[PDB]
């Protein structure tokens, strides 16, 4: 249970970090449009 539960924890962490990464990509695209 603990090993498979740790797999789920790491999967959720990567998923949350992917949401954060999409947000940083949006933010850079917003600046890019203005700065150039």
């Amino acid at each position: 249970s603990g090993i498979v539960q740790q797999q789920n924890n790491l999967l959720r962490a990567i998923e949350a970090q992917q949401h954060l990464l999409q947000l940083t990509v949006w933010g850079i695209k917003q600046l890019q449009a203005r700065i150039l």
């Binding site: 603990g2 539960q5 740790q6 790491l10 970090q17």
Partner: protein
């Protein structure tokens, strides 16, 4: 829309820090189960 972006950043950052905390606790439990 930057205010909205900041709010989504804050929200996912909080989510991932919670997930990392649960992950560290579970890692400790799994390692001690194996040793013990």
């Amino acid at each position: 829309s930057w205010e909205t972006w900041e709010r989504e950043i804050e929200n996912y950052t909080r989510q991932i820090y919670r997930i990392l905390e649960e992950s560290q606790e579970q890692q400790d439990r799994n390692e001690r189960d194996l040793l013990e």
